[PDB]
Amino acid sequence: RKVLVLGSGYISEPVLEYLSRDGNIEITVGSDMKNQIEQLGKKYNINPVSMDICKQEEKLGFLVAKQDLVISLLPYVLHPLVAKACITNKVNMVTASYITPALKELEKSVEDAGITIIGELGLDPGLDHMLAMETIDKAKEVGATIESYISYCGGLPAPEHSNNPLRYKFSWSPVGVLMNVMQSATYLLDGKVVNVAGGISFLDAVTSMDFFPGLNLEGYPNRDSTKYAEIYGISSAHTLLRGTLRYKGYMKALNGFVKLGLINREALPPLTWKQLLCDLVGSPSSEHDVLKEAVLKKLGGDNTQLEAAEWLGLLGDEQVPQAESILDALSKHLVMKLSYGPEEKDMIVMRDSFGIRHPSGHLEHKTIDLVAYGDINGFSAMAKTVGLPTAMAAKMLLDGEIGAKGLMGPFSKEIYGPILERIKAEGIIYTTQSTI
Amino acid sequence: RKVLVLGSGYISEPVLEYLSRDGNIEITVGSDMKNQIEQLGKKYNINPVSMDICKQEEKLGFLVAKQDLVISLLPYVLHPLVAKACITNKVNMVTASYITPALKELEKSVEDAGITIIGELGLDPGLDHMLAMETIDKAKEVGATIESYISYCGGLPAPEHSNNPLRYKFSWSPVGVLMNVMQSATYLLDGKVVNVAGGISFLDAVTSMDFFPGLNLEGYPNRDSTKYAEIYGISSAHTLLRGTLRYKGYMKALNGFVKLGLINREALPPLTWKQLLCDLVSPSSEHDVLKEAVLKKLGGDNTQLEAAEWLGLLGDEQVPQAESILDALSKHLVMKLSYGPEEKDMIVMRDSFGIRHPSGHLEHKTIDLVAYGDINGFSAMAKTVGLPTAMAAKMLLDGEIGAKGLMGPFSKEIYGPILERIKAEGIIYTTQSTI
Ligand SMILES: NC(=O)c1ccc[n+]([C@@H]2O[C@H](COP(=O)([O-])OP(=O)(O)OC[C@H]3O[C@@H](n4cnc5c(N)ncnc54)[C@H](O)[C@@H]3O)[C@@H](O)[C@H]2O)c1
Ligand SMILES: NC(=O)c1ccc[n+]([C@@H]2O[C@H](COP(=O)([O-])OP(=O)(O)OC[C@H]3O[C@@H](n4cnc5c(N)ncnc54)[C@H](O)[C@@H]3O)[C@@H](O)[C@H]2O)c1
Numbered sequence: 096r097k098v099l100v101l102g103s104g105y106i107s108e109p110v111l112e113y114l115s116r117d118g119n120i121e122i123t124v125g126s127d128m129k130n131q132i133e134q135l136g137k138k139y140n141i142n143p144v145s146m147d148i149c150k151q152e153e154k155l156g157f158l159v160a161k162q163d164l165v166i167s168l169l170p171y172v173l174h175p176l177v178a179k180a181c182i183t184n185k186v187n188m189v190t191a192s193y194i195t196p197a198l199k200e201l202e203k204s205v206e207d208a209g210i211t212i213i214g215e216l217g218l219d220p221g222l223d224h225m226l227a228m229e230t231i232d233k234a235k236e237v238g239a240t241i242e243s244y245i246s247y248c249g250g251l252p253a254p255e256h257s258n259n260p261l262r263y264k265f266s267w268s269p270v271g272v273l274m275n276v277m278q279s280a281t282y283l284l285d286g287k288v289v290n291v292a293g294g295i296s297f298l299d300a301v302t303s304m305d306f307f308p309g310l311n312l313e314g315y316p317n318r319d320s321t322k323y324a325e326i327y328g329i330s331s332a333h334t335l336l337r338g339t340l341r342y343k344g345y346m347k348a349l350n351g352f353v354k355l356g357l358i359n360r361e362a363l364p365p366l367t368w369k370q371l372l373c374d375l376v377g378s379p380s381s382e383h384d385v386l387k388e389a390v391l392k393k394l395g396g397d398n399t400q401l402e403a404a405e406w407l408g409l410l411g412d413e414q415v416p417q418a419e420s421i422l423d424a425l426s427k428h429l430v431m432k433l434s435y436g437p438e439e440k441d442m443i444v445m446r447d448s449f450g451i452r453h454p455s456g457h458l459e460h461k462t463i464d465l466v467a468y469g470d471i472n473g474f475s476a477m478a479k480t481v482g483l484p485t486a487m488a489a490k491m492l493l494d495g496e497i498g499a500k501g502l503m504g505p506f507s508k509e510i511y512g513p514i515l516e517r518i519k520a521e522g523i524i525y526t527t528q529s530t531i
Numbered sequence: 532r533k534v535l536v537l538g539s540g541y542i543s544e545p546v547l548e549y550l551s552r553d554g555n556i557e558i559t560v561g562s563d564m565k566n567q568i569e570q571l572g573k574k575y576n577i578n579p580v581s582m583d584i585c586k587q588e589e590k591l592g593f594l595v596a597k598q599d600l601v602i603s604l605l606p607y608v609l610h611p612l613v614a615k616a617c618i619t620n621k622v623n624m625v626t627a628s629y630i631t632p633a634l635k636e637l638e639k640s641v642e643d644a645g646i647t648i649i650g651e652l653g654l655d656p657g658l659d660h661m662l663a664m665e666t667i668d669k670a671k672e673v674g675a676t677i678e679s680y681i682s683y684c685g686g687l688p689a690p691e692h693s694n695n696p697l698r699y700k701f702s703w704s705p706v707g708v709l710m711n712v713m714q715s716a717t718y719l720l721d722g723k724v725v726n727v728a729g730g731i732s733f734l735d736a737v738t739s740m741d742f743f744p745g746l747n748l749e750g751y752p753n754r755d756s757t758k759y760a761e762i763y764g765i766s767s768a769h770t771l772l773r774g775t776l777r778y779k780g781y782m783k784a785l786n787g788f789v790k791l792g793l794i795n796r797e798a799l800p801p802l803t804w805k806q807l808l809c810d811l812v813s814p815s816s817e818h819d820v821l822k823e824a825v826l827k828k829l830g831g832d833n834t835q836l837e838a839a840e841w842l843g844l845l846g847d848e849q850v851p852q853a854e855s856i857l858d859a860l861s862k863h864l865v866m867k868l869s870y871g872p873e874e875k876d877m878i879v880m881r882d883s884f885g886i887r888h889p890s891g892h893l894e895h896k897t898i899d900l901v902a903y904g905d906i907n908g909f910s911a912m913a914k915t916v917g918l919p920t921a922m923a924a925k926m927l928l929d930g931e932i933g934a935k936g937l938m939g940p941f942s943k944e945i946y947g948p949i950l951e952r953i954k955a956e957g958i959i960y961t962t963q964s965t966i
Contacts, residue, residue, distance in 0.1 A: 254690060255879070255901040257745030308698050309690035309747050309778040342745040438959045440901075444691070466691040466875070468903045472957040524873050524906045 102168035103131035109482035191217030215504040218480040225511035241329040243450035249340030253440035260403030262342035270426040282320035282336040351400030440469040465525035538604030539567035545917035596620040627653035638937040651939035654915040661946035677765040679885035685776030689875035696838030698778030718756030747779040787835030876904040900960035
């Protein structure tokens with residue numbers, strides 16, 4: 096019963112805690128920050144291993160060969176290296192990340208090696224899949240058909256911590272999501288494939304999410320959504336739309352960063368934000384602060400967007416963080432200024448809406464609400480919902496509860512059934528309501 | 532250490548849980564609802580005692596004499612009965628209730644008995660006092676003076692459970708809250724005493740609380756704010772205002788019930804809501820579309836009408852038996868908007884001072900406290916009420932409070948340790964100042 100956890104990010108702690116409970120699981124932890132592992136070693140009995148998986152992919156193979164299960168909590172690019180070691184060594188594996196084309200290229204040997212690899216555990220993906228599949232299957236067991244599926248999700252700060260220009264606090268580097276604002280989105284509505292362009296015009300797709308009168312939510316569609324007809328088996332539905340939730344004004348706040356060229360991949364030019372932004376407003380590069388400001392508003396001139404820039408210090412003398420790109424730096428800056436404090440609460444909000452046509456002809460509207468709040472004295476809501484389902488599927492693999500073999504997501508009741516039940520004991524509870 | 536808990540309502544459960552932790556406290560629980568006590572006995576190691584305080588006063592003296600401490604979690608009217616047994620048997624006592632004139636009557640015998648009775652623990656009163664005094668004392672000890680105190684508080688549903696016409700769910704009987712909309716409010720602003728009358732016009736006093744861009748809160752003043760100058764020692768302030776927080780649209784929805792005459796203490800006239808509601812507008816009977824247009828007349832805001840049908844007040848449903856039209860409404864609101872077993876409640880609390888320093892500069896300080904209920908545990912209201920009660924109980928046992936007599940939690944000796952140990956339970960309040 097030996098388990099190797101790759102990566103020691105804060106998503107790892109609620110996993111260690113969950114698997115440590117019975118004491119019959121030998122936990123090894125490996126990563127490239129010896130500090131992260133030292134702190135974790137104080138709270139849980141774990142064999143620590145310092146390793147750069149990218150560079151020492153052979154020491155990784157030797158380590159992998161010794162385990163009964165590998166849980167990859169590494170940045171998802173590295174998952175293929177880990178799956179390779181697991182495939183040659185016949186060791187089961189789980190991840191909390193999208194099964195990429197790269198990792199899917201390996202699907203056959205995974206079935207030839209006779210191992211099980213369960214990916215797309217976690218929050219999004221993960222619990223979203225499991226909630227959808229649960230009710231999509233429940234409809235089919237009664238001869239019903241899915242006509243519409245609208246799902247929205249978002250990890251946010253608890254509302255009392257929402258008073259900043261972005262109405263947001265970042266659980267990790269936003270390098271990935273920020274760039275996604277420049278993307279087009281695609282979804283299905285009333286039988287027609289709908290496409291919305293990203294960039295400056297993406298703010299037009301943003302909409303008010305009025306599920307809860309007490310909460311000020313805006314939503315906007317994800318990149319694709321249309322893929323879920325095949326993924327979930329709902330080819331008959333006329334609308335499929337998955338989206339993200341924020342507090343109102345966040346996207347407008349980002350719309351500014353796009354206008355200023357901050358969501359940009361180029362490299363960085365004693366550098367300060369006013370200098371860096373001077374270079375970005377064409378004027379550069381050592382002019383009076385008020386002159387720099389007159390030009391920022393020119394790309395506008397919306398004061399709310401200017402107010403957000405000043406509040407963060409992007410027009411000030413503060414030093415730009417070292418990074419290989421403007422975005423990389425901006426992300427590292429937003430982290431220094433809007434990370435969660437040790438006594439601040441985050442939030443998870445998830446609302447699904449299914450249109451279920453029954454063979455009798457009745458149209459049922461089913462909604463599922465899942466809201467969780469962080470525990471200051473325990474784990475965050477994001478850490479609970481990302482790390483628990485991963486940790487739960489791992490124990491199920493150990494305890495021998497998943498017979499399916501190969502490379503798979505968490506779509507079969509064999510997987511989502513037990514996880515959805517045992518997360519209740521952990522405070523992740525959802526609620527349902529139907530009407531006809 | 533032996534402790535007697537009087538009352539087995541839902542506030543007792545987070546108190547039992549807190550006292551049970553060290554295992555060196557023998558808990559006795561007594562009340563008149565046997566089945567509440569049985570359920571608690573399954574979850575906690577407790578001596579169950581069936582007792583009606585009004586009738587078995589003698590049995591009450593016997594049990595108290597055996598304890599090191601009595602925690603009265605009974606309806607506050609009975610607390611004096613419990614105080615007598617404690618004074619006579621020289622046993623310390625704590626409550627979570629406003630210290631009434633009746634109870635202050637005994638204040639001398641409490642000091643003659645040499646015991647401590649700490650009241651006004653809990654949320655309001657309780658945590659309200661302790662947060663204010665914490666900050667006021669900090670200002671006064673560096674020679675500062677309080678110029679303004681604006682405090683807002685509210686127990687509400689967590690925002691995910693706010694989708695109903697009132698944006699509210701009731702933790703207990705709303706008779707108290709409903710009637711307060713008919714009472715006037717009084718406070719002090721910029722040196723001038725402000726008066727706002729209740730009833731229909733109280734909706735004009737309602738205001739937007741924009742502390743949190745993510746939350747849609749409204750606020751309004753309580754019955755009496757000016758009394759807090761004496762309670763906190765801040766006669767110096769030019770502004771005193773304590774108020775209640777709700778989700779936007781609650782007071783408007785309540786404004787409808789008042790327009791319709793539902794907030795009324797007179798008696799009720801096989802009676803149905805449509806039948807009763809016709810008598811309040813024509814009877815008796817008959818057709819729904821007739822009432823709907825007539826209900827609309829007392830308005831004519833249809834939004835307030837949307838709330839009434841949604842609650843079934845225009846329907847064939849039977850009105851509950853009750854001594855008054857109100858109360859009937861309360862019992863109905865309880866039947867239709869109580870908390871389900873998987874719904875989360877909330878506590879939201881913001882204070883704003885108000886502080887002039889001897890250097891002459893003006894400090895604005897805000898204290899935020901927010902708590903959420905736990906589906907697998909206790910509600911936010913239960914935690915914030917029972918924890919400060921249970922903690923002061925442990926402090927009295929463990930000997931950390933030297934004061935004697937009848938007192939609230941205003942002294943650093945009490946509120947200090949309590950506030951510190953509350954944070955350890957995940958209930959966090961944060962302070963922020965600027966100039
Ligand atoms: N399903 C979900 O909802 C969800 C949400 C967020 C993150 N995730 C997944 O969480 C995982 C970790 O989060 P992250 O992607 O932000 O990365 P991260 O930067 O937080 O790093 C995670 C851990 O891996 C370590 N690490 C990084 N590179 C390493 C290397 N070359 N060798 C050894 N250790 C290395 C890091 O030190 C860290 O301890 C990812 O796989 C991510 O896709 C899933
Ligand atoms: N400071 C605060 O924020 C706050 C908030 C809520 C409640 N409280 C206090 O909690 C206490 C109880 O709450 P509640 O009144 O809403 O519920 P409640 O009136 O039902 O009282 C709870 C318990 O008292 C028992 N009880 C009532 N009469 C009894 C009798 N004659 N003999 C034996 N047991 C009797 C009940 O059976 C019940 O178990 C009250 O004193 C209230 O002041 C304080």
